[PDB]
């Protein structure tokens, strides 16, 4: 994993947020519950 | 498995689980935070 502090989330240029740092070691745990995926293209027809 | 349109590979495909997947994420680094005085009232939190 990689950590960034200067953030432009929602990509809106002109305005960026700098997240301050968090003290000590960080830990968190989450239920993965869904996904967002993209397919491919025509390529070979029906092979895979 | 829901997608507005699957024939359209460009349409993102959204998935819903019946079972949650656990994930354990850490920043395994005990972090110092310096607070820097740029004020009056303005203070910047750096990393020690």
């Amino acid at each position, epitope marked *: 994993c990689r950590i960034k502090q200067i953030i432009n989330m929602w*990509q809106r240029i002109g305005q960026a947020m700098y997240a301050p740092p968090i003290q000590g070691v960080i830990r968190c745990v989450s239920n993965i519950t869904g996904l967002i995926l*993209t397919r*491919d*293209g*025509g390529s070979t027809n029906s092979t895979t | 498995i829901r997608s507005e349109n699957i024939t359209n590979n*460009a349409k993102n495909i959204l998935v819903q689980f019946n079972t949650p997947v656990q994930i354990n994420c850490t920043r395994p680094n005990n972090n110092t935070r310096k607070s820097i005085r740029i004020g009056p009232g303005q203070a910047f939190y750096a990393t020690g």
Partner: antibody
Amino acid sequence: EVQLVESGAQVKKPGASVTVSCTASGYKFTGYHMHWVRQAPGRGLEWMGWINPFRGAVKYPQNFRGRVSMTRDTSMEIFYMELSRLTSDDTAVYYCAREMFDSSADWSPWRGMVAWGQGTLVTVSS
Amino acid sequence: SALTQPASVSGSPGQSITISCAGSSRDVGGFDLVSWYQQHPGKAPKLIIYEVNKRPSGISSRFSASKSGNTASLTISGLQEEDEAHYYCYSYADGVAFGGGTKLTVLG
């Protein structure tokens, strides 16, 4: 007016890789898909992929996958495209082109390309 | 190319001509994404038709297109010297399919 303005034509050795710049203007840059298309001399058109300028999503064909690197500089409004491992077969005039409507619309990005780069001639010979 | 076009078509100036684009049910038949492009020699291509029968703004009423089953057809009426160019058909087939391109000339 919009305007797709591409880079200058380039004369290159085989085996190498080459990028093409294509700078957009005259519309909401980040909202519109950009296709890249080569056209080998006298031949038909080879669709090489596309980018969505919002966060940079892409999709290439199976033929062109691996060799193609397609990007954009939202800050500067420049699209970049790089075919790599150039062979004599990779000699073509390379275009960038924009689909009819913005990304918010339905069925974008598969409608039809309107604005057209001037073509960039890339020549692969030994 | 996955879409099959005539190699060359000859038409007398002023007449009416038609260009065919045939594909599987995967592209032409099952979709209305047929679109056509004109390209003058040594120039960038230019969109002409889309959604099987749609003219972008700036396309003369002489130009029209349609699809009949798995075979779409492009038609030009009252031809004129400006139309001597290369013409390629397009349809979406999960990726991007393309017609081989047809050359337009003068007949007689």
